[PDB]
Amino acid sequence: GNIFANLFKGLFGKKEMRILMVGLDAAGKTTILYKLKLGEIVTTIPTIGFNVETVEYKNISFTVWDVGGIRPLWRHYFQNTQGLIFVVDSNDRERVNEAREELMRMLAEDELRDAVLLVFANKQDLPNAMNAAEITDKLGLHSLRHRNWYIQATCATSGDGLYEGLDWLSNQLRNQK
């Protein structure tokens, strides 16, 4: 709601910022966006089979799309992305190896070289959900000795961890550029 509006209020200014939130399908990306209550989640299809949800807050645009189904059109988007958030279904032990692939494939893009990474280890409320330490390992985030990263455990449905992780991210951008 507002606690999130406040967060991003310090990042306001004549400049179009982009915060990419990608992850596999059903990771909790649309739920996290609805939870921020920064505005209307509007869907558009840039290209057939390319669904993009966006919440435009002010100069800050929240762009979301599923991953693993790369793509050219993506680069255009990358050309504005200050920060990338990657949400993982901690309870989906089966597709984290994929999450890692795409993640590594995203970090490996030239325009996203100077982008702050925030990994949301969502669905923490599920009984056999990996913890933020398991996910950091499986994702091999400890080898990303090069970029400003961070992992916050969450539950998009109850909503906790979203503020704490977005607080970090907000701080980072505030002195990113």
Ligand X SMILES: Nc1nc2c(ncn2[C@@H]2O[C@H](COP(=O)(O)OP(=O)(O)O)[C@@H](O)[C@H]2O)c(=O)[nH]1
Give the interface with a second copy as residue ranges (CB under 8 A). 30-31, 34, 40-45, 48, 51, 53, 157
- Name, in order, each residue with C-beta under 8 angstroms of 74's C-beta and a sequence gap of 6 or more: 109
DSSP letters spanning 118-148: EEEEE-TTSTTPPPHHHHHHHTTGGG-TTS-
31 binds ligand X per the rule CB under 6 A: yes
Cα Rg of the chain, angstroms: 15
Per the CB < 8 A criterion, the answer to whether 160 and 35 are in contact is no
Flag whether 124 is marked binding: yes
- List residues near Mg ion by CB under 5 A: 30
Comparing every residue's Cβ against Mg ion, the nearest one is 30
Task: Select the binding partner of residue 83 from ligand X, a second copy, Mg ion, none (C-beta < 5 to 8 A, by kind).
Answer: none
Q: One symbol per residue from 69 to 108: x for binding ligand X (CB under 6 A), - otherwise; what is it?
A: ----------------------------------------
Flag whether 25 is marked binding: yes
Per the CB < 8 A criterion, the answer to whether 87 and 155 are in contact is no
Which positions lie near ligand X, rule CB under 6 A?
23, 25-31, 48-49, 51, 66, 122-123, 125-126, 155-157
